């Protein structure tokens, strides 16, 4: 798995590959790892597919009930609910989740929740087995307040390399853009990103 | 795998005199080959003219002392401020220790004071609460270095009267508080030389009818 989320001038974009493996067998080559827990709060999942789906479903339930009572939750609030589940059940979970969301007050925000269940607010985050190979590239190429097009290029190029070197990553590059304008899904195919 | 136990080193020594008792211990606290503290008190005044030390794993040691001190407080509340006698304190500590029989306090406990006739008393416990009144007891790291010396110099073991050649034993004459303190200091000086976990400082608590007094002495810091 190769996943990342990047804040930019107009908000935040989440990116992910589409490969799901059982050992060396690709059980699903068109997986959607970008999951919606609220209208403009999404997450990237890595680790146990069963665990991260179970967690995401519970979070979506919590934020739906939150919204009915208190109105739209913040991205920080969503990250907290994720953290509570991951931290308290750390013995029985294998889950690495990146939370990304867009407020109008706070704009684009990214939170990463690694194995232990800690929370870290960052300008951008990378995770999954494929992320190891792009720590160098992402650190050198990330800038704050990039344009939408620049951020799409940054994520496309980054996950391209992660896919190239990690056998557990591959397929299509999926992206979800979160701005004031709304929610936009993007997809990029192998013939496009392999020639970069 | 998580190991709930540790070893903080340290060595303690209790000796019962005719009308007094001493409980001594070094002030060094360690893990593995490092020193945590050169002065971390290990022998405590628990009230009612009783002194206590729980040597071994310091977390368990602190917990037990804390619970016993608490037991003394509640004994006063429940029984009209009656003084907790040393024998009663000893039986109470057995139950505190045996209460965790299947997840023990990893310590060797010694208490000292005076019995109800005013004579010096020392009680010694294993980790799970078996106990005995004793005249002399070393505990902890250098206990094996100290006890044989005390058998010889306090109880005059293997010592006979010159001229009789083994026929007449050296008589067991009583020792003063000044005499006992000399043997304690020499016991710890000797232990410091040959045991790496013993050193830094020696703190002695002396118990008489007048109350509890403290004495401190430097030990080698290497």
């Amino acid at each position: 798995t190769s996943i990342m989320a990047v804040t930019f001038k107009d908000g935040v974009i989440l990116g992910a590959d589409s490969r799901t493996t059982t050992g060396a067998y690709i059980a699903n080559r068109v997986t959607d790892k970008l999951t919606r827990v609220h209208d403009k709060i999404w997450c990237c999942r890595s680790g146990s597919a069963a665990d991260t789906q179970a967690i995401a479903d519970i979070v979506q339930y919590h934020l739906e009930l939150y919204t009915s009572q208190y109105g739209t939750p913040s991205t920080e609030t969503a990250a907290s609910v994720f953290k509570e589940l991951c931290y308290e059940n750390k013995d029985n979970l294998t889950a690495g989740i990146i939370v990304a969301g867009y407020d109008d007050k706070n704009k684009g925000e990214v939170y990463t929740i690694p194995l232990g269940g800690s929370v870290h607010k960052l300008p951008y985050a990378i995770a999954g087995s494929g992320s190891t190979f792009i720590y160098g590239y992402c650190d050198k190429n990330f800038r704050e307040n990039m344009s939408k097009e620049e951020t799409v290029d940054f994520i496309k190029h980054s996950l391209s390399q992660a896919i190239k070197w990690d056998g557990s990553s591959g397929g299509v590059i999926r992206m979800v853009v979160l701005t004031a304008a709304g929610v936009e899904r993007l997809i990029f195919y192998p013939d496009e990103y392999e020639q970069l | 795998q998580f190991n709930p136990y540790g070893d903080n080193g340290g060595t303690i020594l209790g000796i019962a005199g005719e009308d007094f008792a001493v409980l001594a211990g070094d002030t060094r606290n360690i893990t593995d080959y490092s020193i945590n503290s050169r002065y971390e008190p290990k022998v405590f005044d628990c009230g009612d003219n009783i002194v206590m030390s729980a040597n071994g794993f310091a977390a368990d040691g602190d917990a037990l002392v804390k619970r016993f001190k608490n037991s003394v407080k509640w004994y006063h509340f429940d029984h009209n401020d009656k003084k907790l006698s040393i024998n009663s304190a000893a039986r109470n500590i057995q139950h505190l220790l045996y209460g965790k029989r299947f997840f023990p306090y990893y310590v060797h406990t010694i208490i000292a004071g005076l019995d109800e006739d005013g004579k010096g008393a020392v009680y010694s416990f294993d980790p799970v609460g078996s106990y005995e009144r004793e005249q002399c007891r070393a505990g902890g790291a250098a206990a094996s270095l100290i006890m044989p010396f005390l058998d010889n110099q306090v109880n005059f073991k293997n010592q006979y009267e010159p001229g009789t050649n083994g026929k007449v034993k050296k008589p067991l004459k009583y020792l003063s508080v000044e005499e006992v303190i000399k043997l304690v200091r020499d016991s710890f000086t000797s232990a410091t030389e040959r045991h790496i976990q013993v050193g830094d400082g020696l703190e002695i608590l002396i118990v008489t009818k007048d109350g509890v007094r403290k004495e401190f002495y430097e030990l080698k810091r290497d």
């Binding site: - | 080959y33 020193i35 006979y160 050649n165 000399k182 200091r185 290497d222």
Partner: protein, 226 residues
């Protein structure tokens, strides 16, 4: 165990504590850890004490024969090469961790060597259980172009840090100074900051205190004439 090595202007100095232990018990309070490989090549050992002694004497013996064969004074790099190849062959089972220093016709040298056979070069080095305490002092006070007096001071200060802070180290500081164009000076018990205080009591017994069953003379002499 704390052992250090420090380079200076015209040579190199090594130092060591004097405590040897078996578990938590101190076996010898005044142990000699500075080993002579050749007159002007000395090394200090940590780890298994028999191994550090044996490997020093073996290489020291072979170094002497080599010196006689070649009609040349031994070199530190030769001792280093012979030590590492021997230790590598035994794949770490010979538990010798050494700091090798000396002067030779090539100049002054300072190396470390580990039990598996890897070697390092440096201006200041430390080994043993008290190496972290020692290295803290070395990293705080070392500079380029140290004098002989400054290097001896730094080395012994580094050993002291081990003596006081590491339970595996204690007692005295031994030093050996190897200067170019001079005899190596071995300073046994250079510092003595751990003398035991007088005891409170004398434990000398009265004669006849111990019970005896039998007495006899032991014949240590050979079979006699006549």
């Amino acid at each position: 165990t704390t052992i250090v090595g420090v380079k200076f202007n015209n040579g190199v100095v090594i130092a060591a504590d004097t405590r040897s232990t078996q578990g938590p018990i101190v076996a010898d309070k005044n142990c000699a850890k500075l080993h002579r490989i050749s007159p002007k090549i000395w090394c200090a050992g940590a780890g298994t004490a028999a191994d550090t002694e044996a490997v020093t004497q073996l290489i020291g013996s072979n170094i002497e024969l080599h010196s006689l064969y070649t009609s040349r004074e031994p070199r530190v790099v030769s001792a280093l090469q012979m030590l590492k190849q021997h230790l590598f062959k035994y794949q770490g089972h010979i538990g010798a961790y050494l700091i090798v220093a000396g002067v030779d016709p090539t100049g002054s040298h300072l190396f470390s060597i580990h039990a598996h056979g890897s070697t390092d070069v440096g201006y200041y080095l430390s080994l043993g259980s008290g190496s972290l305490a020692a290295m803290a002092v070395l990293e705080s006070h070392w500079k380029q172009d140290l004098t002989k007096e400054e290097a001896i001071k730094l080395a012994s200060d580094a050993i002291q840090a081990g003596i006081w802070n590491d339970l595996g180290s204690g007692s005295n500081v031994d030093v050996c100074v190897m200067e170019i164009g001079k005899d190596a000076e071995y300073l046994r018990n250079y510092l003595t900051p751990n003398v035991r205080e007088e005891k409170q009591k004398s434990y000398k017994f009265p004669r006849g205190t111990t019970a005896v069953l039998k007495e006899s003379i032991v014949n240590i002499c050979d079979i006699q004439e006549e």
